[PDB]
Scaffold this active site. Structure first.
Site, mmCIF file in Angstrom:
data_model
loop_
_atom_site.group_PDB
_atom_site.id
_atom_site.type_symbol
_atom_site.label_atom_id
_atom_site.label_comp_id
_atom_site.label_asym_id
_atom_site.label_seq_id
_atom_site.Cartn_x
_atom_site.Cartn_y
_atom_site.Cartn_z
ATOM 1 C CD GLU A 56 -2.658 32.000 21.348
ATOM 2 O OE1 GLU A 56 -3.009 32.737 22.300
ATOM 3 O OE2 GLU A 56 -2.536 30.760 21.477
ATOM 4 C CG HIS B 197 0.800 32.348 21.442
ATOM 5 N ND1 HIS B 197 1.022 31.021 21.740
ATOM 6 C CD2 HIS B 197 0.272 32.900 22.566
ATOM 7 C CE1 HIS B 197 0.680 30.786 22.998
ATOM 8 N NE2 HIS B 197 0.204 31.906 23.519
ATOM 9 C CD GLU C 217 0.067 29.563 26.422
ATOM 10 O OE1 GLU C 217 0.725 30.622 26.593
ATOM 11 O OE2 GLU C 217 -0.788 29.431 25.521
ATOM 12 C CE1 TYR D 137 -1.081 30.291 30.584
ATOM 13 C CE2 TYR D 137 0.182 31.820 29.248
ATOM 14 C CZ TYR D 137 -1.017 31.211 29.558
ATOM 15 O OH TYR D 137 -2.149 31.512 28.848
ATOM 16 C CG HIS E 217 2.421 35.499 25.848
ATOM 17 N ND1 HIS E 217 3.082 34.598 26.657
ATOM 18 C CD2 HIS E 217 1.268 34.899 25.476
ATOM 19 C CE1 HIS E 217 2.378 33.482 26.728
ATOM 20 N NE2 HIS E 217 1.268 33.643 26.030
ATOM 21 C CD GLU E 218 -1.414 37.158 23.434
ATOM 22 O OE1 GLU E 218 -1.859 36.320 22.636
ATOM 23 O OE2 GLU E 218 -1.352 36.946 24.678
ATOM 24 C CG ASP F 287 -12.835 27.473 30.216
ATOM 25 O OD1 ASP F 287 -11.790 27.896 29.674
ATOM 26 O OD2 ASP F 287 -13.933 27.427 29.640
HETATM 27 C C1 LIG Z 1 -2.788 23.101 32.156
HETATM 28 C C2 LIG Z 1 -3.878 23.947 32.347
HETATM 29 C C3 LIG Z 1 -4.921 24.007 31.430
HETATM 30 C C4 LIG Z 1 -4.881 23.217 30.276
HETATM 31 C C5 LIG Z 1 -6.010 23.233 29.237
HETATM 32 C C6 LIG Z 1 -6.410 24.626 28.711
HETATM 33 C C7 LIG Z 1 -5.845 25.114 27.546
HETATM 34 C C8 LIG Z 1 -6.218 26.356 27.050
HETATM 35 C C9 LIG Z 1 -7.160 27.129 27.719
HETATM 36 O O1 LIG Z 1 -7.501 28.347 27.211
HETATM 37 C C10 LIG Z 1 -8.331 29.197 28.000
HETATM 38 C C11 LIG Z 1 -8.507 30.452 27.154
HETATM 39 N N1 LIG Z 1 -7.241 31.095 26.742
HETATM 40 C C12 LIG Z 1 -7.582 32.391 26.153
HETATM 41 C C13 LIG Z 1 -6.259 33.144 26.092
HETATM 42 C C14 LIG Z 1 -5.534 32.676 27.359
HETATM 43 C C15 LIG Z 1 -6.345 31.461 27.859
HETATM 44 C C16 LIG Z 1 -7.727 26.632 28.891
HETATM 45 C C17 LIG Z 1 -7.355 25.383 29.380
HETATM 46 C C18 LIG Z 1 -3.807 22.362 30.107
HETATM 47 C C19 LIG Z 1 -2.755 22.309 31.015
HETATM 48 ZN ZN LIG Z 2 -0.053 32.089 25.552
#
Ligand SMILES: c1ccc(Cc2ccc(OCCN3CCCC3)cc2)cc1
Ligand SMILES: [Zn+2]
Ligand SMILES: [Yb+3]
Ligand SMILES: [Yb+3]
Ligand SMILES: [Yb+3]
EC number: 3.3.2.6
Length: 607
Positions: free
Chosen positions: A268, A296, A315, A380, A292-293, A372
């Site tokens: 986003e 955001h 999310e 979500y 969705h985007e 990651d």
């Molecule tokens: C539950 C799961 C993961 C997290 C932390 C997290 C937050 C954001 C993250 O972004 C990864 C990259 N984005 C790019 C667009 C969709 C995903 C990756 C991990 C928090 C709660």
């Molecule tokens: Zn999102």
């Protein structure tokens, strides 16, 4: 405390502005330049601060026109290396200074993918794209790499004159590079304060086409016509989103369609949403990703998670708005259909991690966890489920939408926690506190597994999907003759996808069943990425060798993690394809996105 950042926290100092001047060198796969951070002290007698970095080479740091002392600490795995800067003069509370850091990135930057010409559509020019969420901005430039700090930015980017640069910002002109006439300088301004994970850069042979009053689509030439059609509902969705969230504050809403290795459905980035070309179904059927985007632009980009532990705020609320946009366009039965589908995906994710696993909690603790590795559908869909449950508890969608709009208003331009959100929920719904106190807050927010209550869902559009899935699962050999192409006659693409999702939840099916399914439905012919993904998973889990080459091809010809990771994992779990999966990963690893390469390697136990 942001446990994902090594930088000075917002209570010590705050970045107010970044001015980035850099040059993109495709020969060396480096970005080189200066990051000038305008920093405001939040303390009396401030004499040093610390920034995040990751695989950055620092040449110098300049304050008041002179070089100053700095030190890079030891690398802390995925968090990178802290950079301590010694200020030449102690700062008073609220005093601002400018710190200019000369730096260069590593070709291995986890924020970046560098593509060769052969990896692009046009085959003549290379291509670069960034993706900073959650904590990869530190692999592009030194910063307080935490979403608890918001800053404006300006940028000047020098690129080969045959290419185009775009950023998450308003375009502010282009000129030849006075230092080099083989190059152009593109300029950008982002006047709305943003968390640094929203900084984005693309450089490539890009062309644009207008598709609404505030929207251009950008891609390589060979994708422009298809993209303009696929995303033609964008302005109508923006208008609905404004009705739900309040004014759109970002000026332009452009779309960039990336090469196939882009690892996500969308990112986003403000003024310039990034999307996967796997959305190009030909019939606009995957447009919920655009909704969705778009959403955001309020939930995430205006109201922002204070730390990544509270990612569900970003999310859950965005999926909630997404599904209202799709409900406005296609009806309330469709909103329920997509909501119930989302619960199914939550079931899948919980089953994948395990029902007691800490990554299935809504609010997570990312201390010593690479974000990651935690990333999944949980924030979500468990987030969406909570909001949908609250909607039903508190009197329905129009009442709850009043809350969403007031929430966005309250916390615009701020960064917040789960406790901030809950406090405001209780304030807004003060006359329904007795209903709010019936919610098992500890279970919903902090317990692993499926939520303690499942919402009520209209079943109208789902019933035929479930009915057909159950026919197949309960079929014996002598029933297979009864199936026919006419079974699919009255099913939309969304319903075909749900039929496959339902069936995949009970996989494997007998091999003879799956062969019959191809004989009568010809799912091999469908190029809709969501449907083809689930179909190929069903085939591989049911041990059909004919599907091995199809699944390997899909796994490698695109790189959206939602598709690539489970396809590789399924191929590895199938004895007949296991060695090919590993060899295929090994051969492609060097040219994959760095994050995707890391995660597939971990999934396959290949180092
Ligand atoms: C539950 C799961 C993961 C997290 C932390 C997290 C937050 C954001 C993250 O972004 C990864 C990259 N984005 C790019 C667009 C969709 C995903 C990756 C991990 C928090 C709660
Ligand atoms: Zn999102
Ligand atoms: Yb201008
Ligand atoms: Yb029978
Ligand atoms: Yb090895």
């Amino acid at each position: 405390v942001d446990t994902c950042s090594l930088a000075s926290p917002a209570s010590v100092c705050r970045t107010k502005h970044l001015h980035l001047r850099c040059s993109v060198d495709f020969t060396r796969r480096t970005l080189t330049g200066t990051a000038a951070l305008t920093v405001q002290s939040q303390e009396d007698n401030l004499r040093s601060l610390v920034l995040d970095t990751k695989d950055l080479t620092i040449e110098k740091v300049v304050i008041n026109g002179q070089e100053v002392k700095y030190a890079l600490g030891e690398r802390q795995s995925y968090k990178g290396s802290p950079m301590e800067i010694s200020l030449p003069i102690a700062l008073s509370k609220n005093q601002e200074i400018v710190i200019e850091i000369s730096f260069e990135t590593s070709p291995k930057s986890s924020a970046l993918q560098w593509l060769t010409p052969e990896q692009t559509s046009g085959k003549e020019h290379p291509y670069l794209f960034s993706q900073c969420q959650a904590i990869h901005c530190r692999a592009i430039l030194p910063c307080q790499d935490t979403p608890s700090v918001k800053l404006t930015y300006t940028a000047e980017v020098s690129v080969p004159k045959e290419l185009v640069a775009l950023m998450s910002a308003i375009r502010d002109g282009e000129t030849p590079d006075p230092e080099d006439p083989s190059r152009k300088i593109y300029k950008f301004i982002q006047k709305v304060p943003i968390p640094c994970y929203l900084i984005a850069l693309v450089v490539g042979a890009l062309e644009s086409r207008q598709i609404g009053p505030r929207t251009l689509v950008w891609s390589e030439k060979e994708q422009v016509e298809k993209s303009a059609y696929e995303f033609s509902e964008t302005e109508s969705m923006l208008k609905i989103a404004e009705d739900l969230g309040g004014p759109y504050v970002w000026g332009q809403y452009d779309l960039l369609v990336l090469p196939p290795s882009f690892p996500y459905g969308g990112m986003e980035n403000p003024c310039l949403t990034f999307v996967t070309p796997t959305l190009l179904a030909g019939d606009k059927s995957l447009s919920n990703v655009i909704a969705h985007e778009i959403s955001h632009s309020w939930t995430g980009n205006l109201v922002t998670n204070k730390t990544w532990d509270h990612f569900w705020l970003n999310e859950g609320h965005t999926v909630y708005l997404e599904r209202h946009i799709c409900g406005r366009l296609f009806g309330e039965k469709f909103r329920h259909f997509n909501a119930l589908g989302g619960w199914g995906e939550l079931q899948n994710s919980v089953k994948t991690f395990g029902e007691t696993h800490p990554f299935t909690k809504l609010v997570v603790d990312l201390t010593d966890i690479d974000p990651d590795v935690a990333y999944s559908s949980v924030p979500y869909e468990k987030g969406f489920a909570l909001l949908f449950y609250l909607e039903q508890l508190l009197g329905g969608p129009e009442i709850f939408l009043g809350f969403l709009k007031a929430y966005v208003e309250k916390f615009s331009y701020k960064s917040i926690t789960t406790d901030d959100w809950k406090d405001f929920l209780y304030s807004y719904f003060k006359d329904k506190v007795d209903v709010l106190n019936q919610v098992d807050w500890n279970a919903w927010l902090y317990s692993p597994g499926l939520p303690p209550i499942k919402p009520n869902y209209d079943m109208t559009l789902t019933n035929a999907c479930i009915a057909l899935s159950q026919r197949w699962i309960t079929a014996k050999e002598d029933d297979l003759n009864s199936f026919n192409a006419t079974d699919l006659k009255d099913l939309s693409s969304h319903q075909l996808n749900e039929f496959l999702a339902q069936t995949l939840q009970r996989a494997p099916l007998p091999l003879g069943h799956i062969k019959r399914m191809q004989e009568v439905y010809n799912f091999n012919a469908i190029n809709n990425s969501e449907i083809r993904f689930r179909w190929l998973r069903l085939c591989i889990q049911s041990k059909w060798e004919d599907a091995i080459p199809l699944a390997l091809k899909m796994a490698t010809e695109q790189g959206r993690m939602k598709f690539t990771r489970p396809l590789f994992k399924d191929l590895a779990a199938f004895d007949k394809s296991h060695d090919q999966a590993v060899r295929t990963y090994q051969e492609h690893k060097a040219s994959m996105h760095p994050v995707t390469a890391m995660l597939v390697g971990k999934d396959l136990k290949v180092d």
